[PDB]
Structures are given as C-alpha cells and as structure tokens.
Design an enzyme around this catalytic site. Structure first.
Site, PDB file in Angstrom:
ATOM      1  N   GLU C  63       0.822  -1.225   0.000  1.00  0.00           N
ATOM      2  CA  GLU C  63       0.000   0.000   0.000  1.00  0.00           C
ATOM      3  C   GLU C  63       0.851   1.269   0.000  1.00  0.00           C
ATOM      4  O   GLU C  63       0.464   2.275  -0.648  1.00  0.00           O
ATOM      5  CB  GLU C  63      -1.073  -0.038   1.132  1.00  0.00           C
ATOM      6  CG  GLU C  63      -2.179  -1.045   0.816  1.00  0.00           C
ATOM      7  CD  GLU C  63      -1.807  -2.495   1.073  1.00  0.00           C
ATOM      8  OE1 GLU C  63      -0.747  -2.760   1.726  1.00  0.00           O
ATOM      9  OE2 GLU C  63      -2.579  -3.367   0.605  1.00  0.00           O
ATOM     10  N   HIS C 133     -12.139  -5.704   7.707  1.00  0.00           N
ATOM     11  CA  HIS C 133     -12.842  -5.458   6.446  1.00  0.00           C
ATOM     12  C   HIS C 133     -14.158  -4.727   6.753  1.00  0.00           C
ATOM     13  O   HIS C 133     -15.170  -4.909   6.056  1.00  0.00           O
ATOM     14  CB  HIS C 133     -13.087  -6.753   5.643  1.00  0.00           C
ATOM     15  CG  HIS C 133     -11.861  -7.596   5.475  1.00  0.00           C
ATOM     16  ND1 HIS C 133     -11.555  -8.617   6.346  1.00  0.00           N
ATOM     17  CD2 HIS C 133     -10.840  -7.535   4.589  1.00  0.00           C
ATOM     18  CE1 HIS C 133     -10.419  -9.183   5.978  1.00  0.00           C
ATOM     19  NE2 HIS C 133      -9.974  -8.560   4.902  1.00  0.00           N
TER      20      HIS C 133
END
Ligand SMILES: Cc1ncc(C[n+]2csc(CCOP(=O)(O)OP(=O)(O)O)c2C)c(N)n1
Ligand SMILES: Cc1ncc(C[n+]2csc(CCOP(=O)(O)OP(=O)(O)O)c2C)c(N)n1
Ligand SMILES: [Cl-]
Ligand SMILES: [Cl-]
Ligand SMILES: [K+]
Ligand SMILES: [K+]
Ligand SMILES: [K+]
Ligand SMILES: [K+]
Ligand SMILES: [Mn+2]
Ligand SMILES: [Mn+2]
Lengths: 391, 329, 329, 391
Positions: C63, C133
């Site tokens: 990321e 999530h």
C-alpha cells in the site's frame, strides 16, 4: 524439471543454504586514482575541457556556499543547514550525465545537482532565509530546495518517501513517450525504509526508466552501516528485485559520470530500472544540530576527496594551475557573499501566504482563518515581528 | 513527598525515568534510531554504558520496523521502550500502531498482548521546525481504541507520567514537548514515582472560566489566566489534560459545571483536533451550565510553516482575545 | 436532466465513472492490487480490455508503494486513480497520504503538486467483516489539511462524486460503502456528470430536528425520520454530508438554526470521530438556537467485532432512542 | 584497496553492471520424487514410522476439515473461510522440525501447524463459528486462529505485519536465553509489503534466532508472480540482507522438514536469521469470496500434491495400504463432523464481551458504553438476535 510458477530453477538433491558474499562484495568501479591519474584508458570518457571545468567549478562553488551558510547557521542567521562535504563528486558527476530535462527526486544532500543545473545563488539563499524571493514562499526548513524550471522536485524531510514517487513519475514518462529518465537520490540509511522496498520492486515489475542513486557515506547521523544492514551494502539488494546494479567510487567524478551516463542510456532505451551505489564518506557533521565527534574523518578529507582528485586531473591536462585556483576561489567567494548579503536584507513573505496552496483553491473555512489572523494583527500587531514581513 | 530531588530539565527527567526503568526491570530494553550514543535530544545519554549494548541499541532507519519490532518484544512480556525520532515520523508506523498494537489484546481474546510496549517521541513546535519537526499528531491517535496517548508539561510531570506509561499494561505513546527539553529545570525525584494516567490536573483554581490545554500550551494558558486576572478581573481555572486518551472527562466537566465557560487550546490544527472531542463531550454533559459557546483556539488548518511560525501558533494573545470575547458573549 | 440513464448498483456506477474518465482523459491510469481482472469487488471489470494493460494494471502488494507511486504519476500532471483494496489497509500508506500527498502543493509554493491523484477504497461495515474489512477511517484523515475525503450514499451519488474527485485539482480519498456495491440499483446517467464537493445535500426537509450522516448511515437516518414522524409526530430534516473535508459548515448550520436540534450519526467509533468536529462547530455557530445538546450516535470505542456486529452498529433503534430523548430534553 | 566503511570490496577498472540470475535461479531442494521415492539416500532424514504417520494424518485431517468448512461457508453457516489445499506439506513438514515451544507467527494459510500441534477440532470450529468456546471471544473473522498454550500467535488480516513482530519476539528470546526459535510464515504477495523489508533487515542487524518461511504458491489472489516481483523469487532477496537462504520443494514434506530442522539448529546456535522459500501451488480459490477461474490447477492436484506424494512414500515402506486409507478417511470424517455439529449448536458469547480487552482494564467511559447497550437491549431487545447469544 520444476514446474512452480514462482521461480525458474533446477532441482537440487542436496541441502545447501545460500551464503551472502559480504567480505568480497560487489567491486567498486574506479576511473581515476587518488592522484587524478586515469587507470584504464578504454574507460576514459574524454570529456571536453569546458565540461570538466564545469564539474570542477560546480563542486568548488558548492563547497564555498556550504562554508558560508554553515557559519550563518552557527550565528543563528538561518535556522538550519546541511553540508555536502564529500558528496560533491557524486552530485556533479551524475548531474552532468543526465539530460537537462530529466526529472530529479532527492533529499538533503543533492544541492550540487541544482548547482550544475545553474540554479541561482540568490535562490539557494532565498530558500534558506525564507525571504520574498523564495518560490517555496518560506514554508519549508532550509535546504529544502525545489525548482520546476530545472526539473528538481521539491525536497521533503521524511526519508525515502520520494523513492516510490520517482517510480510513478518514471511510469508516467514511459507512457508519455517522453524519452526522459527519472533519477532518484537517497542515502544508505534511507534505504532501510519500507518505501525503498516499495520503489525498487514497483520499478522492476512496472518496467520504469529510472535510476536509483544511493549515496553510501558510512553513517546515518550516528549510526554506522554495521548497524544499518548486514548484506553487501545497497548494490547487492538490486539484483534480488531484478534490477541491474553497480557500485562506484563516489569520490571519482568520472566513474560516477560513466555509470550514470550508461544507466541513463539503457534505462530510457529498455524501460528498466538501474541502481548505482556511490561509495563516499560524509566528511561534515550530519547537520547543524549534530556534533559528529560524539560518535566517530581527516583521512577522507586529506587523502581521498572528490574536489582534490579532480583538481589533480585538471593539473595533468594543463587545464588548471595555482593562479586560476586562487582567482576562482576569490571570484566564487565574492559571488556567494553578494547573494548572501542580498538574501539577508530581503523581507520575508506576507504572513497571508501561510494560508495559500494548502489546497489549490482556498476553502471558505480557511479564508475565514486567514481573516481572523488579519483582524488579530490589527489589534495585537505590536506583539508580532511585522517589520520583517512583506505587506 | 518523593525523597531526594535534583534540578532536571525535561530531557534529563526522561533519562532519569528510563534509568529507573532499566534498573528495576531486567526485561526492559530501549531502541530506535541513534539511541545508542545518547539520542539526538540526549534522552538516552549514559544508558548503553550503564546497562549494556543488548539493552540500549540502534535499529535500522525504519519506523514501521521499530514499532513492529517493539510489539514483538512486548508479545513475549518484555518491556519495550521504542523511540521515534520526531513525532512527525511516526506515520510510517501508523498501521503497526492502529491495526496491530491497539487491537492486539482485543482480537486475541487476551491470549496475547503488547501491554509492555511504550513508544516515546519528541513532539510540538520548536520555533523553526517547519512541516516535519513541529507536528502534534495526538488527534490522529485519539480515534484509535486500545492505545493510550500521554503528554507531560514539565520535567517532574514527564518522569512520573513516563514511568506510568512504561508500567501501564497497555501500549502507550508518550509525546515529549521538544521545546522543553532544555528549557528551565525543576526539582525532580531521583528515585522512581508515578503520576496516574487518564487524570487531568487542576493547576490553578478559578471561578469564571475553565482553560484546558496540554504540553507546552499549558504554560500559555497559565499566562493567559494571569493576563485575564490583571486586565479583566476574570478568575480562570487552569487545567492540564495530561492524558489524551482515555481522557479525564470527569475533571473537565466538574470544572465547567462550576465556571460555565470553557476555552480549549492546542498547537494542532483546529479541524479534527482533540479540542473537538472535549468540546462536544462537555457540551453533552454540561449543556445547561454553558453561559457561552465553548471556544477552541488552535493551530490553523494548514501544514506547520517555517518562516510564519510566530503567526501560526495559538499564542497567549490569540487565547486572551478569544477569552475576552467569550467573557463578553 | 443528465441524458440517458440505466439501472446501476454502486459497483457498476464506479465502473461507469472510471470508464467515462479513461475515455475523456488520455493521461488517466488505474492501478492497485487485483484491479486488472476487474477487482475483488468488480469495480474495474472490462476496463483493461477496453483501455489497455498500460492503463489498468496490477501493482505489487504494497500500500505504501501504491500511494507513493500514484503521487509520482500525479506530479507529472497525469491522472492517477489508485485503489486500496479495503479502507482498513490504507494505514501502511498513511505517511504517503498525510506527510506527502496532503502537503505537496503547500510545501513547494505550488511549484509541484499531486492534484491529479484520487485514492478510492471500499469502506464501512459489511455484516461479518470484523476488525479489518469493516473500518470507517474518515476521522483519521479529517485532521490532515490538504486532502479531500468524500463518501457517497448511492450509485447516482457515487458516480457524480467520483467524477468530481478525479477532476478536482487536489489529492482526494473516495470511500465506497462496500455493503452498497450489490445492494439496490438506481438510475444512473451513462455519460459523465459531476456533483460538487464540500456540498451537503438536504434530502428531506424538516422543522423539529436536523439529522446528519454519510454513506450507508444516510439510509439509517432516513428510516429514523420516518419512525419519528410516525411514532412521535416529529419532523426531521435529513442531511447527507457527502464531503468529510472540507465540509459544508453552512448547510449544516442553516438547518440547525431552523430546527434547534441536531443528531449526528456514524459507524466510526465515537471518540475522535468526525461527529465531534461537526458538533463542536455547530455549537460555536448556533449556540443561541440549541434547544437540546447535540447528540452523537456512533460505533462504540472498540475495534469492529465479528460475531457482535448487530450489537455494535449505530442502527435505527439506537438513533431513534437518542432522538426520542433529545426531543424530550 | 578501497577504504569506504559501507562495503568490503576490491576496486574494478571496468564498467560492468551486475545482472540478476532469474532464468536459472536458486535451485529447488527435493528429497523425494513425485512417486514418493528418495532421490539421494544421504539426505533421507529416516523419520520413524509413528512420526511420518503423524505428518500424513495431520495433512489429511486438515484436508477433511477444509472440505467441510468450505461447504459450510457456501451455505452461509460460517461467514468466511480459506483453504489449505497444497499448503499441507509446507505446514506439517516445518511444524514437525520445530521444538513444541518454538513461537509461531503466521497468517491465513498455517492451520496445519496448529493441527500438527494437536489443536482441538472443537477450537478450530469455535473460532470459525465465533461461539462461546472460542478463546478469541468471537471477535475476529473465521480462520484467525491463535493459541497461547501451543505458542501460535493470533493471526491478523493485515498482511506482513507479523514479520517485524516475529523478529522482536526472537530478539526477546535471545535475551531470555530461551534456546527457542521463532518461525514466521508469510506468502510471496505479503513479501512485497514494506514490513517484510523491515523484518528481514532488523533480524540480520540485531542478530535474531528466527526462521522466515515464505510460501510461494504463484499467486496473490488474482496476481501472478510475474506482476509481484521480477527477481528470482523471495529466496534471492535473503542474501542481500545478509540472511542464509534456501529454496525447497513445498510439495515434499521431507525437503521442508530437512531445511526447517537445519535452519532451526543453526538459528538458535548462531543467533542469525534463515530464510526458507517453499515452492508450492495454491490449488484452491484464494478464499470463499474468490472464484479463481476468473484469472487462471488440475496439473498440480493430480500430478504434484504433498498428500499424494507422502502416501506413495508410506506405501513403499509398507506403512500404509488401501484398507488403512479407507478407515482413516472414515474416522477423520466422523471426528470433523462431530466437532462441526457441536460447534454449530453452541451459543455465541455474551454481547458484553464486545467491550472487554480493548484495554486490559475497561476505562470508565467504555463501561458507560457497555451500560448504554444493556439499557438499550432492555427496551429494544426484540429487535436483536438475542436468543443465539449467551446471557
Ligand atoms: C522517516 C524519517 N525518519 C527519521 C528522520 C531523521 N533523520 C533525518 S536525516 C537521517 C539520517 C539519514 O541517513 P542517510 O539516509 O544515510 O543520509 P545521509 O545523512 O548520510 O546523507 C535521519 C535518521 C527523517 N528525516 N525521516
Ligand atoms: C495490507 C493488506 N493488503 C491487502 C490485503 C488483501 N489480501 C488478503 S490475502 C491477499 C493476497 C495475499 O497473497 P500471498 O501473500 O501470496 O498469500 P496466499 O493467499 O497466496 O497464500 C490480499 C491482497 C490484506 N489482507 N492486507
Ligand atoms: Cl530530519
Ligand atoms: Cl483480507
Ligand atoms: K523525502
Ligand atoms: K505500556
Ligand atoms: K484529484
Ligand atoms: K498479519
Ligand atoms: Mn548515510
Ligand atoms: Mn501467494
């Protein structure tokens, strides 16, 4: 024959760990010895006199500027400084090998690149003083230089963040069919950051025309390389990412130039990254907050310096002498002092400039804060150093 | 109260805390960039010689590694005191802090934890630090359940709070106001002592207005209280918050119920700053007592500038002017 | 109003936005983990075949690299649309976002910028996402001057807002409520259109109370308005904030001046959540109009749990109960 | 002779970039062929019958559990699952080479390690169902296993974060004179993360008794390794950090066992890190949200599988046959179904448990939130699935 998608390799029927070769690492490419003598004539770039004098005058002018601005910091005239002592050859050797429009990302120790690109003394000064001439509007600490005209992306203090950025700019250049390279400078300490692993890998997998240029000068502030890594420096990391890699004598402007010139030619033609690790020594303190005698120099300064080495080469060609040296030392001091004096006397930018460019436009709520400061200064202005700032 | 004291500045008080920790806790280690020679702000001087190279040591230059490494040490039950060289450079570690350290105990049902981790880092403005050696990141961390965030205002406060962080059974971030490192000394006990976390300190009683701040900004509001008394005949109750999370809601609300007015001040930018959480909570709990809107006097919503610093900071004049308007509302 | 429409769910509306972008802007590229085959939520289906592998491509699994890479592309003036696979995994990039992207224009005096960067990422609860999530990280980013943070509530809203983010000359984070990706479709223009940033939408006029939310929580407060009308005869003004920063202070304050009551709701935890910034600002600007304390009905100050999700979320009953108490204050 | 502190190397007088060897990479260590035959007798570990049957029964029991829980997910009985198909040999071969008290960090694909360590079927189930028997208190998504008793650190979803943590735990072990290793598992995709570069480097410079175990199964979700890196897999990265490295056939439990056993012996004795890259193939989908046919299997499943290979070896020794195979397949199915049924019928934990362990103690303001939920459920409880939860 092995079938695994993850690697291309044969089987082996005996257990053998792969051992790193750190004791005799990747060899150090040299073109001239410490007496300025060419070692291997087939490697001599035979740069013309005017260009070689430019390398030399760029290095020495930087060194002159360093001496003055380091003193200015000690007197509290500027808040902060970082010298380039020993990084002058890496700077100017690599810059001379680039095309003028190749985009440069760096950090603190790359001022020689700007110097080679004819960045005005007035602008180096304006940034260190944060005065009205600074295009950075006095917002960053000193030596955080940037120049859009000379394709030198503004420096930022967080180490290694420019590395994956440089890769992105290189990807964009590839798409644009720019026929341009990007070069990205960083120190051996900064190479420990996660962002270095990000940039190296992306450049390989996304096939980017980038040169990674690592200045390995043996220390990151107080930290010796023995505490920074245990592999064979940074150059040995490149092949593990699929990157063509080389190590050079960073005190040899010609070795630096040759390796950068070839890296640039191949990176642009092949859209693949190249890693150059330039071996140097940080002769100066880390910065003006550092007394380096706390953790460690005369060898490097008198026995192996980029400026001295090039000076010896110049003498051998009949391209320099003591009289020229004296005259240039005087002229360069005069030029730096003229810029220094002018920089110190300029006002700082209007305090309103603290609010612009946060976003391209200024949000209404931000403008409201700017108005609140204006009102504040109307009532309490006597308590602020307003006489120094533009109005 | 606490045995023999000696004059210490804030960096010395940190060294004292760390020394006391290593002496009494054989598991404890201190690590980060440049800590071995004593640190770039001198906070670890002498400790490697005193305690050994295996206990006070340099890491590679990698914040995400420093924090992940610290968490690992803490997972085994050993005390891990990590340094991040400037608070501005804590962001590479934000994932390790927020997704890992803060959530470690909860997500494992208490089978594992990293309670013995403390992260200490220089913090706040320093006159010329500009964008990356001035930041006050506490609001970023305040939105993360599972970590504690603690900021002292003085050497005596710093040693007692840091000892509490080191001994607290939760991962703590301790922010040291760097402009105070070599500012004035005060008397600090040589032997270990603790100041409780999640406990504000009323440092001056008052009846007309409550002022809340932390770090160096405590000294600003103390001066503002003096200015208000002299120029307005206004009595200010001055409160050092000390722990950002979990914060001392009760001490703040009690004060505002008494005074009916609240001004909160911090160097960090206004928007999303921690003053917002205090103001909204006080508004909910003390609504009927509020004589005037709660005032927030904060840094502007910009990056922290180099040459413009004198104009950026929420100084005593900005705080005083806000207070004057609030008293007049 | 906007030409031919077709029924689209939220993932399809994102694909439409992206398609329209690549068609009209030859510089634009889309990259991230698993985007090439269409993405783990289908948002990039078809685009690599349509526009080429050099324009829609996978990165390595990193990321901090994705964001640093995006910033670099944007520095050259090319439009960079980065994907972060779940908002929960945006934290490795927090340094690139906060220290670099947000500060790029300011720190260079506008010599360089990364205005053509947009980071899009799935966001918010999904019924069983648990700690990693489910997250709603917008408050973390709200404390960072120089970035914009934008969250749509529907397919029509998502396409117009995402087009605005892509075209806005500032680095934008666009959070896509993943529980809506395959929820109900609505009519969405096939051709490009824009919805302005930093502009809230009053979706239902009312006179007794103002309700503010964003993302999926907008649908919750709409239902709460209906419950209040039916059960209490209370008229609620329902507002979708849309842009977290810079936020539409004026639209919110105007509404609260009219109603005199405000309830703000978000899935993110209460402490340091963005409701705190709205509440404190409204309190400052609308103090004299406030009939009752501003209410915040938020996620609890815990990590987001797996099996306990039904009990964690600020659902319509929690919101309704808060509203009932506020109406009665 | 070069004098630079940053590397140990000779000079070279010719410009030569160092080229990565990716076409014939680090060879793949094998002990048995695909027919279960020992290739090189000097490499045969000659593990005793009872131990080898344990490797085999651990793998197959995992596979049985995988089949059932994958189906359970498809029916919406559990919310999420990730299979181990093809990772069974890497799991059980490496676990068998560890000491019982060696600390394990992993992620999603390491359940065989727990299986080998005799983790109860009831507890695997309790975690996937988030029921009252789960020591994780139902807080994490399924397959996020952890066991303090078996030294298996709770899994977390963010990739690679465990890598620098594992190094810290290894440093602490060294200091404690634990005579213990730490092992740290991760995939080839996760190796791209910045945290992998952090952990590898710290382990080398801080001299930590750690085994890095990378499962290279050719894909990270949809991403083939051609898009993940361009070096010679992960094993070729180790030497650049100064780490002793090896690559093994991950479908060969004996090659995995031999390399792990030797890595463990040397890591503990020498306080130095070892990297093992195990070449496998992810036979199953990435997880239950994935239909892998969208981006790519029968070769690997029928031609090169860890379970089949070990089964062939067992037959050659006279240590297994068709009758034993049938009986075990039946017994293992019965055991998994018994645990499955019990798991499905247990209540979930008290909803109060959503608030504990956020901090060790519960802050007063958090307790206030817990009380607010209790009040809420008193009035609105009919609207919540309370009949399923412990009270
Ligand atoms: C992320 C981050 N961490 C720490 C620092 C503090 N710091 C400024 S320079 C420096 C040493 C950098 O060493 P190296 O990369 O080797 O460059 P050199 O100074 O030797 O040229 C450090 C630790 C920083 N600027 N950024
Ligand atoms: C920081 C982060 N980013 C993205 C994800 C989403 N994700 C979950 S598994 C996965 C692929 C991991 O691949 P690899 O490491 O090769 O392991 P494998 O699944 O092949 O065993 C991804 C991208 C995540 N969990 N964490
Ligand atoms: Cl710095
Ligand atoms: Cl995941
Ligand atoms: K930088
Ligand atoms: K602690
Ligand atoms: K944008
Ligand atoms: K993990
Ligand atoms: Mn260095
Ligand atoms: Mn994989």
């Amino acid at each position: 024959k092995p079938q695994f998608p993850g690697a291309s390799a044969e089987f082996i029927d005996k257990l053998e760990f792969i051992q790193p070769n750190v004791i005799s690492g990747i060899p150090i490419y040299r073109v001239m010895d410490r007496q300025g003598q060419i070692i291997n004539p087939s490697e001599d770039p035979h740069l013309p006199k005017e260009k070689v004098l430019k390398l030399y005058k760029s290095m020495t002018l930087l060194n002159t500027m360093d001496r003055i601005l380091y003193e200015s910091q000690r007197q509290g005239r500027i808040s902060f400084y970082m010298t380039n002592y020993g990084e002058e050859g890496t700077h100017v050797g690599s810059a001379a090998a680039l095309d003028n429009t190749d985009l440069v990302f760096g950090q603190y120790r790359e001022a020689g690149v700007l110097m080679y690109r004819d960045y005005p003394l007035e602008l180096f000064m304006a940034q260190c003083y944060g005065n009205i001439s600074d295009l950075g509007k006095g917002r960053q600490m000193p030596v955080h230089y940037g120049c859009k005209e000379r394709h030198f992306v503004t420096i930022s203090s967080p180490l290694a963040t420019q590395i994956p950025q440089a890769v992105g700019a290189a990807y964009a250049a590839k798409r644009a069919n720019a026929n341009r390279v990007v070069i990205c400078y960083f120190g051996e300490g900064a190479a420990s950051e996660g962002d270095a692993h990000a940039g190296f890998n992306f450049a390989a997998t996304l096939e980017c025309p980038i040169i990674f240029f690592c200045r390995n000068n043996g220390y990151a502030i107080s930290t010796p390389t023995s505490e920074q890594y245990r592999g064979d420096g940074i150059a040995a990391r490149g092949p593990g990412y699929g990157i063509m890699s080389i190590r050079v004598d960073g005190n040899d402007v010609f070795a630096v130039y040759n390796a950068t010139k070839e890296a640039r030619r191949r990176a642009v033609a092949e859209n693949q990254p190249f890693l150059i690790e330039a071996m140097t020594y940080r002769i100066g303190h880390h910065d003006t907050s550092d007394d380096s005698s706390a953790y460690r120099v005369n060898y490097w300064d008198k026995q192996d310096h980029p400026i001295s080495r090039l000076r010896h080469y110049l003498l051998s060609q009949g391209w320099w002498d003591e009289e020229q040296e004296k005259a240039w030392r005087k002229q360069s001091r005069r030029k730096v002092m003229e810029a220094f004096e002018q920089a110190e006397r300029k006002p700082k930018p209007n305090p309103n400039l603290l609010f612009s460019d946060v976003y391209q436009e200024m949000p209404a709520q931000l403008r409201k804060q700017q108005e609140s400061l204006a009102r504040h200064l109307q009532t309490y202005g006597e308590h602020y150093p307003l006489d120094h700032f533009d109005k | 109260e606490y045995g023999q004291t000696q004059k210490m500045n804030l960096f010395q008080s940190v060294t004292s805390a760390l020394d006391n920790s290593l002496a009494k806790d054989p598991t404890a280690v201190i690590f980060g960039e440049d800590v071995a020679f004593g640190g770039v702000f001198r906070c670890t001087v002498g400790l490697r010689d005193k305690y050994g190279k295996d206990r006070v040591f340099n890491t590679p230059l990698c914040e995400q590694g420093i924090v992940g490494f610290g968490i690992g040490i803490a997972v085994t039950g050993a005390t891990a005191i990590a340094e991040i060289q400037f608070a501005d450079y804590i962001f590479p570690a934000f994932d390790q802090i927020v997704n890992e350290a803060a959530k470690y105990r909860y997500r494992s049902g208490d089978l594992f934890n990293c309670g013995s981790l403390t992260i200490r880092s220089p913090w706040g403005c320093v006159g010329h630090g500009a964008l990356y050696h001035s930041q006050s990141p506490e609001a970023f961390f305040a939105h993360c359940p599972g970590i504690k965030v603690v900021i002292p205002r003085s050497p005596f406060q710093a040693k007692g709070l840091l000892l509490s962080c080191i001994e607290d059974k939760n991962p703590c971030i301790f922010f040291e106001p760097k402009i105070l490192y070599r500012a004035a000394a005060e008397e600090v006990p040589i032997e270990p002592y603790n100041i409780p976390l999640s406990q504000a300190e009323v440092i001056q009683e008052g009846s007309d207005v409550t002022l809340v701040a932390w770090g160096t900004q405590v000294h600003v509001i103390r001066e503002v209280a003096s200015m208000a008394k002299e120029k307005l005949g206004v009595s200010c109750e001055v409160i050092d918050l000390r722990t950002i999370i979990p914060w001392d809601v009760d001490t703040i609300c009690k004060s505002v119920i008494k005074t009916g007015r609240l001004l909160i001040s911090h160097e960090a930018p206004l928007t999303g700053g921690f003053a917002s959480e205090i103001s909204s909570t006080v508004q909910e709990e003390c609504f009927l007592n509020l004589e005037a809107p709660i005032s927030r006097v904060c840094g502007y919503d910009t990056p922290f500038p180099h040459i413009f610093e004198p104009f950026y900071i929420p100084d005593k004049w900005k705080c005083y002017d806000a207070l004057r308007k609030m008293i007049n509302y």
